[PDB]
Write a protein that binds this ligand. Structure first.
Ligand SMILES: *[C@@H]1O[C@H](CO)[C@@H](O[C@@H]2O[C@H](CO)[C@@H](O[C@@H]3O[C@H](CO)[C@@H](O)[C@H](O)[C@@H]3O)[C@H](O)[C@H]2NC(C)=O)[C@H](O)[C@H]1NC(C)=O
Ligand SMILES: *[C@@H]1O[C@H](CO[C@@H]2O[C@@H](C)[C@@H](O)[C@@H](O)[C@@H]2O)[C@@H](O[C@@H]2O[C@H](CO)[C@@H](O)[C@H](O)[C@H]2NC(C)=O)[C@H](O)[C@H]1NC(C)=O
Ligand SMILES: *[C@@H]1O[C@H](CO)[C@@H](O[C@@H]2O[C@H](CO)[C@@H](O)[C@H](O)[C@H]2NC(C)=O)[C@H](O)[C@H]1NC(C)=O
Ligand SMILES: *[C@@H]1O[C@H](CO)[C@@H](O[C@@H]2O[C@H](CO)[C@@H](O)[C@H](O)[C@H]2NC(C)=O)[C@H](O)[C@H]1NC(C)=O
Ligand SMILES: *[C@@H]1O[C@H](CO[C@@H]2O[C@@H](C)[C@@H](O)[C@@H](O)[C@@H]2O)[C@@H](O)[C@H](O)[C@H]1NC(C)=O
Ligand SMILES: O=S1(=O)N[C@@H]2[C@H](O)[C@@H](O)[C@H](O)[C@@H](CO)[C@@H]2O1
Ligand SMILES: [Cl-]
Ligand SMILES: [Cl-]
Ligand SMILES: [Cl-]
Ligand SMILES: [Cl-]
Ligand SMILES: [Cl-]
Ligand SMILES: [Cl-]
Ligand SMILES: [Cl-]
Ligand SMILES: [Cl-]
Ligand SMILES: [Cl-]
Lengths: 35, 816
């Protein structure tokens, strides 16, 4: 369910800086960009 | 950059339910069952899909339980599009029917629809997308995680910033050279996010989703279809296409008269003299000071006596601090309730040039009547010919108001787009302030457009001829009422180069009357920069040299003799081409055509053109390849497949002081470009009307005309001329114009008379220049009789013919 190609990821935190826990609590995927 | 926190495919969206078919198209209910992280989700929406034309698809997503803010806007056989729907998650899918290409697919991300946050996403068909003004950017927008903010803002143009105007329209190219356009009719603060998949997200802070899709298939057809909805460009007066000269710092009528004198003595054409804030009494609208400007009315009357026009700056904000009864614009505005009001119902007070100011509400019909009266009364004192409307974001020198702004959800919204200053209040008025139609929150991006509409109407009533309005702030559909200049550009090589993409972008958005301040506004120009900027700027559809208060002078007559010669040549060529430029504005006005256009609009099937934005065309036929860097004596430009004739091979007469043809297979060509030269090439197959010289259009319009005939290899060419009185209203409706087609075929040139009336009948044709004549003719005939005189150049293959003909009477010119 979190296997989305990097270029096709749509922002689930456009409103504020978010932590992994808050992101997952929203029902979203947390995967840091590699750069 | 790429988001670390992103939606899984299972993220809750809306579900489509009860899809139904209508005569117009489709209707459905959309239901969200899981709330988003934004407040005030609208859980039940109505979808309406309207199949309006074969090339226009329209859909709306609204709250069926509450009227929401909507932008005020005037209204084999098969469509080019097909539409399908995803049920869960909800999406609209639009295919191009001809090749099955997916143009729109909103299933790619969740639909968000909350009171102050709308988000709709789509796949894009390619990495090539243009539009979403106003930003300092390449014509083709970067898809590398780019956030584009639409929130009208007073800021000197710089990359990555929301600037003076907002145009929520994009044109997307498809592999093979087809294109489509998308218009989101939403005036709220918004971010548009582009990503490399490629995909786009609209993120708006209010209103509804009102979406138009234009199927093209040609880029020129997409622009025309968009302009069908927002309005075809207004027809300018002919004089408006002449040279305009302005600065901040012409501080008296004596100094302003010296500008015209100095231009005239140095043989520089000038149609329109401008003043900035200098004319006013204490920087107030509809006044003039009794020091430097005591004889302002006489100065303007004298300009008119010499065949010139006059323009001056008008700001929106009205001085509120004067003694009661001493300043009619404020006193009468107060009486009639014309101003934007605050929470207690009093005028919102900000700070602009005169000090404390109130802001007119141009959505209030009574404010329109007040503005008409103030313009008409001032015009009875000083007969100005148009209005330069500045600071109409609206610009505020303080944040919000003198009394600050209240703490509410409009001033402090749940989603703030990427605006400079990080707040909707920065450099403007309170978002929760009251206007007749809605709050400033919803109407801000329309403020400049509403002032342009009010000013257009005011000028029609005051003068009874075509209005001439130049506006800083704009919105989609602005071009129906007014033109634009790109604002406070620095006098730099970077801003000279950036002006080309920006002028092209506004032409795609239906604002063809656009230009940048020639030689730049801020800072000090150099002589070399001012020569190159005058050369390029002579191909801006709106050509004005304007200059800031603290800058060194940059009028053409203020430079060295060699620089003056180059600037004179540029102005001479523009004046010679005015009948052609006017005809291009006619095509914009009647058919939604562009005036200045990128190569990709004219040659979309040649993918090499897609990234070219440092060259421009005028219409189909004139390719301009400017030098945009210091120290350059050559330029490399792209030449699409065909023959391009050097315009230097066409004789042009001036009042004061290299390959003849490029044969291109579609390739980059290095051209000589010394300081005194700008490269201009005429496309084979085209005929251009030209007119003799003048220091004004009043003088030039009385001169004999000429044709430049660029033959194809097969000896063919086509062109046209539109002619009217240059300033009357309702010319096309009344039929008060002449329209002529020129055709070259089999060693002959003829005219075809589409319409001939008194306006145009007596136009004299005295010269015909034919490019691409391979062999010297033995004889040249005009209506069957050997001409008085002709010259043939074997080196340039140019045949130059003297004739005595009338544009409005059928002729036949022949050679062999
Ligand atoms: C709505 O706009 C009106 C103006 O149209 C605002 O009126 C301003 O109200 C402030 C007080 O809140 C006034 O300031 C006061 O001035 C007097 C002397 O002039 C001084 O003694 C007080 O200490 C204070 O500074 C201000 O004069 C007044 N402006 C005008 C032009 O009268 C009103 O506050 C606005 N309402 C909201 C809620 O923002
Ligand atoms: C989807 O529509 C159904 C049916 O609605 C009816 O038919 C339509 C053409 C229109 O004429 C409506 O006015 C009709 O009510 C909805 O289900 C009905 O819901 C109503 C009110 O809750 C109820 O009285 C009926 O018994 C239901 N009928 C059936 C056949 O189930 C349904 O709610 C609509 N869905 C959404 C999400 O709005
Ligand atoms: C529109 O976009 C949607 C979502 O990206 C596409 O649907 C997905 O397609 C993938 C890959 O084929 C499937 O494995 C998924 O199950 C689909 N997702 C959903 C939500 O259905 C869809 O293919 C696109 N439509 C078109 C016509 O291109
Ligand atoms: C118009 O040109 C005149 C003449 O060149 C300018 O007046 C001269 O300007 C210099 C300053 O650069 C003065 O020192 C000279 O005394 C002036 N000469 C004459 C003949 O009067 C004038 O400034 C120009 N005006 C504008 C508005 O450009
Ligand atoms: C623009 O120029 C202003 C005046 O500069 C002075 O006068 C001219 C004739 C030159 O000789 C110059 O070298 C002189 O210093 C400046 O006051 C102003 O700072 C300049 N603006 C910028 C942004 O550089
Ligand atoms: O210098 S400004 O901030 N830029 C505005 C405008 O953009 C300029 O064109 C104009 O000359 C100025 C004076 O009226 C305005 O003030
Ligand atoms: Cl999850
Ligand atoms: Cl949260
Ligand atoms: Cl409303
Ligand atoms: Cl690109
Ligand atoms: Cl009066
Ligand atoms: Cl109302
Ligand atoms: Cl290439
Ligand atoms: Cl290159
Ligand atoms: Cl004749």
């Amino acid at each position: 369910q979190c296997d989305v190609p990097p270029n096709s990821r749509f922002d689930c935190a456009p409103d504020k800086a978010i932590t992994q826990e808050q992101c997952e609590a929203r029902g979203c995927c947390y995967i840091p960009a590699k750069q």
